[PDB]
Amino acid sequence: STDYWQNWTDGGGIVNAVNGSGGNYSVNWSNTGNFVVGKGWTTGSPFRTINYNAGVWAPNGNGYLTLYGWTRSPLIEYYVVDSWGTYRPTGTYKGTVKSDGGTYDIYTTTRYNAPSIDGDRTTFTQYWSVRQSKRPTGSNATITFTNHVNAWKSHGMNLGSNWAYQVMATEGYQSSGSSNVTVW
Amino acid sequence: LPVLAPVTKDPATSLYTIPFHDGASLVLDVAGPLVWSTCKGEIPCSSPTCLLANAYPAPGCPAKPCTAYPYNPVSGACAAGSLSHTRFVANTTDGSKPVSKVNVGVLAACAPSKLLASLPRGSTGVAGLANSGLALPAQVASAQKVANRFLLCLPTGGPGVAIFGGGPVPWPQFTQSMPYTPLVTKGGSPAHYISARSIVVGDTRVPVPEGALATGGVMLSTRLPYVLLRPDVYRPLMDAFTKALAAQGAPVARAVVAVAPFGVCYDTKTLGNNLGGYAVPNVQLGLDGGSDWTMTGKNSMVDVKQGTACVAFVEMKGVAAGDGRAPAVILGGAQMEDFVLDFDMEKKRLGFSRLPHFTGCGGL
């Protein structure tokens, strides 16, 4: 069961986000700038298995349906992207990993003097696993986070020892869309 | 082809530079009509070149070989100088990545080394990016037979991007739906202006005289990291901003002693952090064209010391409220960081795409 509610907007356009019952949330948006909404856990774990069902996945423009989280020591921002809208997110290619029936490209990016959970102007690395093709939604789905962590480990991408939030997120930008996700 | 240079934010000064030639950089001045620099240790003054050169007098300087008056936009200092040919050394590009080396012959003023005061280490002068005939984008346009147009992606850190000459906007994953707002040319100014019709803080819309936000009432600059504001706008915007901040059992923000030149500062131990920066109210500049220019914490708050961040709205001094001769708002550098900006001086429109939180101009 989830204990955390991520809900950030830069205030552009309309973002109606609903904190639903238990692990359920929905987002309806139009003409946005940028937002991140998700349910998960206050303290992420590298051994978590994240189950979710995206009843609705309806972006018109950019948006990611993605595991999203942070660690400290060191500071790391991470993403496991299952589906997206118009454009697929990429970066510096590092390798691949098969997990949960899909195959994912692995990317890093360095973020300089940028916002983090720790501060305004902060330097850190970003880890991505991005599914090579959009993952079906509407059915019960699993993200075995360990598979990613391990593949990331093998390409010199180590996560921190202090774990912060870890959510199944809807990220949207310069777009409109709907999302309905149930997490556990 | 268009010409690409990488853009470094100087940590000490906060000014943005591009490589010029021989380990030397220039400060980007989006209101500056001249390319100028210190010179190696013959234009007539009645010529069109010389008139272009003195078309916009520098504030503290008046006016037979040609003499320009290079302006340090940080110090406000100016001095006499002769025009001279020099090399802008960069890469060509067809989107955002380097194709190959290229030397562009550009006219630049020669400045006495004392005008380097207040500028970044490694900088031997200023690349003016204003809408005038001897600014760098115009000169590159004629020299290279490309568009009088340029792209800025000012970075928070790491290498950002400056492309002179236009062609298609790269990074369609962030730029495909890029909104435009007219560029307004103001008499006797080469600076780039745009028009805002509303400011919104949180959900609360700010009350300014209908038409204190007039046509071309917003200027863009890279001289200061913060926003400068006319008093009829400053007081209402800051009232609404501090209130929305106070009303946000999470820790309430504690004001500390103002630091020069800011008016309102805060203990950072008492500010939250979200994906947009410090957890302060979002701010929405409603620009002509129906799309907003948004500021999050990363844009509306400046770190000054360890422990202290100040509100990046500063009141203009020596100016009467509601005085149409001055811009109501002067957006600065931290408010333009992590935006892709297409300054198109041929179609006279500014394209502005706000990059989403997970990426930035730096390293793009």
Swiss-Prot record, chain A:
Gene Ontology biological process terms, A to Z: xylan catabolic process
Effect upon mutating E77S: Drastically reduced activity
Q: In which pathway does it act?
A: Glycan degradation; xylan degradation
Q: Which Pfam families match?
A: Glyco_hydro_11 (PF00457)
Keyword terms of this UniProt record: Carbohydrate metabolism, Glycosidase, Hydrolase, Polysaccharide degradation, Signal, Xylan degradation
- Give the Gene Ontology MF terms in alphabetical order: endo-1,4-beta-xylanase activity
- Kinase found in the keyword field: no
Please report the name of this protein according to its UniProt entry: Endo-1,4-beta-xylanase A
* Organismal lineage: Bacteria, Bacillati, Bacillota, Bacilli, Bacillales
* Gene name for this UniProt entry: xynA
